[PDB]
Design a protein around this motif. Structure first.
Motif, PDB file in Angstrom:
ATOM      1  N   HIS D 106       0.812  -1.222   0.000  1.00 28.36           N
ATOM      2  CA  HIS D 106       0.000   0.000   0.000  1.00 28.36           C
ATOM      3  C   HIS D 106       0.845   1.273   0.000  1.00 28.36           C
ATOM      4  CE1 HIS D 106      -2.398  -3.222   2.053  1.00 28.36           C
ATOM      5  NE2 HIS D 106      -3.229  -2.907   1.078  1.00 28.36           N
ATOM      6  N   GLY D 107       2.156   1.115   0.164  1.00 31.05           N
ATOM      7  CA  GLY D 107       3.102   2.197  -0.103  1.00 31.05           C
ATOM      8  C   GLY D 107       3.505   3.087   1.054  1.00 31.05           C
ATOM      9  N   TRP D 108       3.609   2.510   2.248  1.00 29.82           N
ATOM     10  CA  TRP D 108       4.106   3.247   3.409  1.00 29.82           C
ATOM     11  C   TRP D 108       5.619   3.441   3.277  1.00 29.82           C
ATOM     12  CZ3 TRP D 108       1.505   1.833   8.758  1.00 29.82           C
ATOM     13  CH2 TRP D 108       0.114   2.017   8.645  1.00 29.82           C
ATOM     14  N   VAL D 119       2.612   8.130   4.710  1.00 27.89           N
ATOM     15  CA  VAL D 119       1.533   7.200   4.406  1.00 27.89           C
ATOM     16  C   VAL D 119       0.649   7.857   3.349  1.00 27.89           C
ATOM     17  CG1 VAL D 119      -0.593   6.137   5.302  1.00 27.89           C
ATOM     18  CG2 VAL D 119       1.537   6.012   6.634  1.00 27.89           C
ATOM     19  N   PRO D 120       0.509   7.211   2.175  1.00 30.29           N
ATOM     20  CA  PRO D 120      -0.232   7.785   1.051  1.00 30.29           C
ATOM     21  C   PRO D 120      -1.678   8.120   1.401  1.00 30.29           C
ATOM     22  CG  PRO D 120       1.000   5.866   0.349  1.00 30.29           C
ATOM     23  CD  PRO D 120       1.052   5.883   1.843  1.00 30.29           C
ATOM     24  N   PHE D 121      -2.153   9.252   0.880  1.00 28.58           N
ATOM     25  CA  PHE D 121      -3.525   9.734   1.092  1.00 28.58           C
ATOM     26  C   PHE D 121      -3.906   9.765   2.575  1.00 28.58           C
ATOM     27  CE2 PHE D 121      -3.184   7.376  -2.954  1.00 28.58           C
ATOM     28  CZ  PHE D 121      -3.333   8.428  -3.855  1.00 28.58           C
ATOM     29  N   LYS D 123      -4.238  12.692   4.759  1.00 33.19           N
ATOM     30  CA  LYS D 123      -5.233  13.722   5.067  1.00 33.19           C
ATOM     31  C   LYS D 123      -6.594  13.437   4.426  1.00 33.19           C
TER      32      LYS D 123
END
Ligand code: FES
Ligand code: FES
Ligand code: FES
Ligand SMILES: [Fe+2]
Ligand SMILES: [Fe+2]
Ligand SMILES: [Fe+2]
Lengths: 180, 433, 180, 433, 180, 433
Positions: D106-108, D119-121, D123
């Protein structure tokens, strides 16, 4: 797919060596991750096909393989193959980054001449050995049924058709990140 | 042993924490076979897999092999693929037609109904034939899809699916002629827990929109395009079931994927045209704009997972805490042209089969997760299922039920809670739908 | 280690047959435990090399193999090899007494000449099936890169240099008491 | 369910009994991961494996995958190779140099220290990143060697090593520049319990000086010279730690087996030379004659073993009660001549690789022992560890520590005793020296 | 069984090719369940043999293989082979109904002429990959020591005698339903 | 942790029911090594496997490796193949002739008696040589067959066999010279529980009379005639051991099956002629029509199984609940013609080897049953063992003991009843024959 209908008079020694050597070279490209060099061997009209295989009684043995209307492990023309090549060379292609360590051992090469000049129906057996990451090992066996043409390139031939008959019903490997 | 108190502590949807033992523990998996798999509704295939009489399909329910066979009166009876004499497999092939089933070990003969009808040398032995047939499962069909349950005390298919049904209808009932299964059943083995698979098709669109499938989209997009374009889907929604842990996620108005993954012909068929007007008309009582939903995923708890738009369906058969079997097949609308059906055949082979351009990466991830969970300190701290925590509202005027944002672990928590409920509440009134 | 640079024009039939048959006989000596006879094929200036192989990102793709200045599975010469021979033929060499049951399946033989007369660069793929004791089975697949000279012996050739590129990062077997 | 009363009844250093169930039983190993490998100091490698900033080495702490990575401030930080979202392996290659670390699921994103940074997206979909990164371990260095520990209240390396410390400096502290590692890490799998490996390099000279390595020494000696001059050693001394179970054995005076293992050139750099006499002044005050030390083994509890005379280093990764991975490298003095470093590389391959003339015999030994332990009556009666009992003086006028004869098992009885302590004593309040 | 005592002078290219092509074809019949046609390749004086293989010390190395007075995995004549063919094609033969997925990878072919013309001693290595039902995979490897007569038919030769030395002691497979 | 009450619930011989978990449960298997194999009479082979002084055969007792070795005094001694020092396999080869047994690890010398004779540096470290040798088993012979037990509290071999002896003598006692074994032990691995294998040769004539071996009979019958014209026998009986759970089944007068298995020349030897007549004079005390006994199966509990008329003998070594090793040989009369010996060799290979036309269909079935037993519901309902229930009597004019119909589960019930009795009752005092 019954017994390959081999020609009565066997292929010439020079032709035998040529096609055998073609396959050896093709295996070297794939085992050293030369996917760009390997893709060039594929013609525009290519049909890359790995059918499904099932468990059937001898009563209904002709249902073993999946037809043209049915699904498959591979059913690729030129553009979709091209799509896979961009994936395997890609940095964000996790299945093969870090890449696997494969070995395509080829033998049992039987050559059949055809109506079209510089074109051959070729039968060959293989065992594909795939080692991945720390301890993963997937061993494949099967045969390849190709339609091959003489080519300007460095390997001697180009591929027009390839049917991979895989000796497995359920795939024991977690993926088919490799090319047969 | 794992007491109700201990099992309840494993999943905490309050703080959004998951105890990593759930994916790895041997003792829980055995209770999973009893508490979850031994009383849940389970997908076994499509009516067209067994269309005519005597047509059978040897599939699984957990690790119990089963036979799904069409009867003369056009019913589909499902029974245990196990002889009750000495446990031999009655049906020993994958599929086909049977005039009658006969056991290979001691020659006990069975009708297609499953009933034991012939025992050789009976008079020099004996007990009643009617009593000694293999165990029978409850059968329920939701427009083609064949589910099975073992428990006579389990709820009916409708109450089990609940408010999730509308999202199944998007894929299924688009035409009065119904849907048909494309021939071929794909089977491959992944060494990882079934819950990873069950959660991803329930909640996890997040993985598609981020790192996992960057190379998968790259394979679909034109050679005159790179990942910067590919038109990247941003917003969307996520459904959580009122009961049953049935989750679904979809993009709205962002075709990027639906084009790249499925080609132009499928995308035009799914969103535009007289064929798609019928779909919006039949399913126009739910209030959804189905012609605008661009790519969708759904999991029916526990192991039935499908991708509506692409029409990819799969059942995860469990094989211990460390391993799963994936059985995948595809559906088409029975009254669809020659081209569209061919595109649906081709594009699912390219993307979601064992060597599919999407599927490869999911497997690579799941393999590495289970490997790490062999470690001691790798199971001591909880994971983070907090995404979209306290965000989903039921008052959404486009999609019915509990609906949040596309990238949320909301449906995840719904899936893990329902699992924990099923594992801790032995009775079905305490486990009230 | 890149793709083996094969010659545009494949080696002659006679030559291709000689070297293949050499490897077949070679496999015979090893699979039937005729070690003292196999050792006689190795020249004085022999270099028997099997480097380690690690998992790398494509970006660090060149750093896969261990160099001539790092540890390896095999980095032997004529002396050290005779030591291993005196070990394997010994009654007190427990790792091979009871002896193993190995099988060298050899294929993919590609032949290339050089500047030195009667000296060839040979590439070949293999699968080694090692069966030990009661239940122990270890399968190896790699490739061999040899420098063979023509010699006046029973096999037609002698080995001057050899590199084995095993398709393994972590060795799944417990040992390598066999020869490749 | 193993209780302290029962665990204590597996090891008796007073008599010399060893209950075989310790190498086989599944439950004892699953407790070993918690009670031993979750709170002992473990060898991760050498400093020179990560010389520059950003350099990393994916290794193991028991079964926990760990990332050892050098920092900006010349310090070394170690963390669990597990993304805390859904368990995905962060660093996926064996070793290299990265600017950062990114999850492929998930791309942390993580910085070189193991700190969670993006951490992507976030906000849009969300929680605190500060307390959601991989679990850091204690990192300690003993002149080159990097050790790690999970337990915050365990003794620091220096204390844990104890009175054995001078023995470690035999291989390590020989020059101002210290030692360096030769590239490459040898990795192979032996189907046996780790305790056999640790015990061998602890007190088991008795195997080398009898039968195990008769062919090993046969390979080393010149073709003319059979097993006639090879003179079979007779004299030697065995050390036992005051606390920790650490042990070591070495031959004394007789330089027979070393000339066969490492050859002539290496032995000159170790016995009679400018550097050989330098150690007898640099480590003269440690109360040790290094020039007399010829052929040596030493085990640091739990899974660290090294042969000082041959400079072989190895870490035994446990892989279930029935299996181990074997990771190994070799060390050389940083400022030594190249041709001494070359003879060190070649011979450590020749003897101690996966296909080494010595290690081939050890594996096949251990393979058969583990196999036999499948049977009932093979785990019924105790093993003999009575060798050299009541024959160790705590004040030997040549070597410090509990010293006796070389073919004894006091160092072995020490290893199983500390083991028994670490398995029966839950608290460090009692376990500390 | 000692190392196959190969002829100093290697076989001719035509013959070496023909014998290889014979096996490649033979494999095709076996791997496509054409058993009756495969049976038609066996002469009436057929000796189909596969000895037991035991673990022995080097001192007792000559008692590794089971003799003519001892049991075997296979010890067949013509009529016994026909019975097996009658079973394998029968529906009531459950061991092969459903049939297995097999692959005979043939390699290492070494040819020896005899006293009789048209008759040959042939050494060859093989790997047999058998996949059965859902997940059953057995992998065998060994050599085939044949005696081949020239025959005027679709394959060119006929099997007079066959000895399969299998690299196993304890068989890891539950059965041997396939042919070698 | 099973209670005797729960263990008694697994087998009910009155109603004829078997809980399937008996073949699958890990917990039950581990107690079996103790309660069954650690005190049952276990076949190790034959005298002719070890004819000369010093001759040995490495074999198994459960999962315990053992060494059957002939002594100087024409006796045979059996000891655990585990070294008492640290567990190495003492005897490394399958068979041969030894003058002394050296241990490969530390060099613990043993003589062919199993006694500890020499220890390297014994005078140095020191415990006495006498009681520190490999665990000895009790060794008892039954007219050729060597059986072995661990515990002195177990009955003597003769009493343990009981009333089963007469039926062993049909195969064994036929001439005043004894039966010799044909060289070569066939060995293969079948993924299933031993109880299926032991039970089949105990009671299950049913399977051979029905579907299992239809194709196997087809192979041995004349090439012209097929199954329809052939002959399907029905007449026969079934024996149940008073104590022990042993059983045997046979056909009466019908050559059909025996002519299909063994051929014409062998049927002759067993039914007519001087050697056949001498058998009907030596078995005079039994009072049985031994020449009318055509085709027979027998199990000596727990794992000794042989087929008298076809002289096929096999041992089932357990390898977990989900696996066995099959070790098979063949016996023949020592003073029999070489033509009959070859015939017996030929047809035994043809039918009962790892690739035997009978053995193939046996494996196919068992593999599937064990696979089925992975499932939860596949163990929820008991198995049928009600065949022949209440038809057995003790007053049979032809055959002595508890004799019933040929197709019965009486001996099977007896076998599973005895198994249940041994697991529960820990003391031989209640277990006594
Ligand atoms: S198991 Fe089905 S009849 Fe015996
Ligand atoms: S697990 Fe690392 S980001 Fe999802
Ligand atoms: S175990 Fe036999 S002496 Fe060490
Ligand atoms: Fe995905
Ligand atoms: Fe050693
Ligand atoms: Fe049978």
């Amino acid at each position: 797919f019954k017994t390959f209908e081999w020609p009565s008079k066997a292929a010439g020694l020079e032709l035998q060596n040529e096609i055998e050597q073609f396959y050896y070279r093709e295996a070297q490209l794939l085992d050293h991750r030369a996917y760009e060099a390997w893709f060039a061997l594929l013609d525009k009209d290519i049909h890359y096909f790995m059918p499904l295989r099932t468990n059937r009684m001898i009563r209904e043995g002709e249902l073993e393989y999946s037809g043209d209307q049915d699904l498959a492990h591979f059913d690729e023309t030129h553009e979709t193959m091209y799509g896979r090549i961009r994936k395997v060379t890609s940095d964000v292609g996790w299945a093969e980054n870090p890449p696997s360590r494969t070995r395509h051992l080829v033998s049992n090469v039987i050559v059949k001449e055809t109506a079209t000049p510089d074109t051959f129906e070729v039968n060959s057996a293989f065992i594909l050995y795939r080692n991945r990451l720390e301890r993963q090992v997937d061993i494949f066996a099967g045969e390849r049924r190709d339609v091959l043409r003489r080519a300007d390139n460095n390997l001697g031939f180009s591929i027009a058709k390839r049917t991979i008959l895989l000796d497995a019903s359920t795939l024991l490997s977690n993926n088919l990140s490799m090319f047969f | 042993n794992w007491t109700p108190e201990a099992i309840r502590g494993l999943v905490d949807q309050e703080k959004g924490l998951l105890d990593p033992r759930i994916y790895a523990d041997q003792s829980l998996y055995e209770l999973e076979l009893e508490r979850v798999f031994g009383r849940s509704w389970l997908l076994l295939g499509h009516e067209s897999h067994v269309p005519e009489t005597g047509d059978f399909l040897a599939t699984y329910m957990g690790e119990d092999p089963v036979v799904m066979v069409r009867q003369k009166d056009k019913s589909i009876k499902v029974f245990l693929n196990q002889c009750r004499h000495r446990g031999m497999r009655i049906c020993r092939s994958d599929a086909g037609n049977a005039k009658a089933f006969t056991c290979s070990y001691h020659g006990w003969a069975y009708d297609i109904a499953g009933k034991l009808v012939n025992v050789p040398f009976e008079k020099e032995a004996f007990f009643d034939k009617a009593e000694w047939g293999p165990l029978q499962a409850r059968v329920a069909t939701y427009k083609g899809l064949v589910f099975a349950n073992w428990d006579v005390q389990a709820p009916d298919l409708e109450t089990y699916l609940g408010d999730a049904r509308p999202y199944m209808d998007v894929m299924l009932d688009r035409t009065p002629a119904g849907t048909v299964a494309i021939g071929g059943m794909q089977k491959w083995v992944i060494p990882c827990n079934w819950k990873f698979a069950a959660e991803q098709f329930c909640s996890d669109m997040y993985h598609a929109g981020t790192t996992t499938h960057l190379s998968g989209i790259l394979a679909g997009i034109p050679p005159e395009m790179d990942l910067s374009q590919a038109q990247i889907p941003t917003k969307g929604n996520q459904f959580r079931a009122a009961w049953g842990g049935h989750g679904s996620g979809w993009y709205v108005d962002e075709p990027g994927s639906l084009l790249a993954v499925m080609g132009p012909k499928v995308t035009q068929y799914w969103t535009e045209g007289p064929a798609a007007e019928l779909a919006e008309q039949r399913l126009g009582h739910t209030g959804m704009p189905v012609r605008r939903m661009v790519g969708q995923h759904m999991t029916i708890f526990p192991t039935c997972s499908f991708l509506p738009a692409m029409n990819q369906i799969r059942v995860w058969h469990p094989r211990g805490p460390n391993e799963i079997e994936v059985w995948a097949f595809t559906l088409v609308d029975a009254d669809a042209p020659a081209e569209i059906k061919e595109e649906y055949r081709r594009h699912n082979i390219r993307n979601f089969s064992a060597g599919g351009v999407f599927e490869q990466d999911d497997g690579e991830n799941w393999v590495e997760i289970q490997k790490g969970l062999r470690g001691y300190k790798a199971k001591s701290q909880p994971f983070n299922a907090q995404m979209g925590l306290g965000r989903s509202q039921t008052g959404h005027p486009d999609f019915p039920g509990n609906v949040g944002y596309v990238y949320a672990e909301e449906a995840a928590r719904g899936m893990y809670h329902h699992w924990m409920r099923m594992m801790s509440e032995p009775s079905w009134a305490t486990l009230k739908p």
